[PDB]
C-alpha cells in the first residue's frame, strides 16, 4: 500500500499526460497487486474490488485509491493514489483529489478504495 504510494510519487510527470490510470496501476503493481485492466479511469472500480479492495469513506490513508467519474471535457474520469498528504495520478496533485477546475466545478462522483 505505502510502497505503491511511494512508487506513484517517485514516478510522476510534471503535468498530466492523460495516463492517470496506467500510472496508478503501475504503482499498485509495484506494491504487489496486478489489476485487471480497463481503458478508462472511471471504470477501474470493479477491477479494484476484485483484487481485494473495499470502499473507504472518510479521511485518506497513505495508499488509498480514488476513482472519479467524468467531468465536462474529461469523459474518461480520473484516478489517483494518496501519498500521505498529496493525491498522485500521472502527476502530483497540489490542490486535491479533483485534478482540475472542470472537475472541481462539476463535482462528479467518486469512490475511494483500500486493502
Amino acid at each position: 500500500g505505502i510502497s505503491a504510494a511511494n512508487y506513484a510519487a517517485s514516478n510522476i510527470e510534471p503535468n498530466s499526460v492523460g495516463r492517470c490510470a496506467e500510472y496508478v496501476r503501475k504503482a499498485i503493481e509495484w506494491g504487489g497487486i496486478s489489476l485487471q485492466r480497463t481503458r478508462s479511469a472511471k471504470d477501474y472500480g470493479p477491477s479494484l474490488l476484485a483484487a481485494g479492495f473495499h470502499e473507504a469513506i472518510g479521511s485518506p490513508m497513505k495508499g488509498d485509491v480514488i476513482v472519479i467519474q467524468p467531468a465536462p471535457g474529461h469523459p474518461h474520469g480520473h484516478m489517483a493514489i494518496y501519498d500521505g498528504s498529496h493525491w498522485i495520478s500521472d502527476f502530483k496533485q497540489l490542490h486535491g483529489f479533483y485534478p482540475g477546475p472542470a472537475y472541481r466545478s462539476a463535482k462528479p462522483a467518486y469512490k475511494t478504495y483500500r486493502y
Binding site: 503535468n15 498530466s16 467531468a71 465536462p72 471535457g73 474529461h74 502527476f91 496533485q93 497540489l94 490542490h95 486535491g96 483529489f97 479533483y98 485534478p99 482540475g100 477546475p101 472542470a102 472541481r104 466545478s105 462539476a106 463535482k107
Partner: protein
C-alpha cells in the same frame, strides 16, 4: 474602492472557495465580483466544453497549492484603458503565474469583465 482592491479581495475569496467540496463559479457570491453576463458565459463553458483552454478561467492553471497561492497574491497598479481597469496579478512565490484582470464600474463598484493569460495567440 479601487480596482486593485476589488482584485485582491476577489482572488482571496476565490482561492478559499476553490476546493474539492466547493468551486467559486457555482457560488452565488460570484455575482458580487464578476459581471453577470461574464458569469453566464463562463457557466455555460464549464458545463459543456469545459473551462476555456483547459485551465481555470480566473487563475489560468489546472493545478496549484492553495496555501502558497493565497499567501502570494501580488498586485500591480491598474492600467487605465479608457474606463476599463486592467490589473496585473501574479500568484505564487516561486515562478509566479501572471494574469490580467479587466474590471468595469457597474454601480460605483468594480466588476470583473474579463481575465486574460499571457500566452501567445492560439
Amino acid at each position: 474602492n479601487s480596482p486593485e482592491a476589488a482584485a485582491i479581495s476577489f482572488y482571496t475569496w476565490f482561492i478559499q472557495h476553490d476546493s474539492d467540496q466547493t468551486y467559486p463559479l457555482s457560488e452565488p457570491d460570484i455575482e458580487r465580483y464578476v459581471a453577470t453576463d461574464t458569469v453566464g458565459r463562463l457557466r455555460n463553458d464549464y458545463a459543456h466544453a469545459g473551462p476555456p483552454n483547459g485551465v481555470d478561467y480566473f487563475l489560468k492553471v489546472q493545478d496549484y497549492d492553495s496555501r502558497d497561492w493565497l499567501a502570494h497574491i501580488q498586485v500591480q497598479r491598474a492600467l487605465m484603458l479608457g474606463d476599463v481597469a486592467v490589473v496585473p496579478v501574479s500568484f505564487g512565490s516561486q515562478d509566479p503565474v501572471h494574469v490580467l484582470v479587466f474590471l468595469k464600474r457597474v454601480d460605483a463598484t468594480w466588476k470583473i469583465i474579463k481575465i486574460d493569460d499571457t500566452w501567445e495567440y492560439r
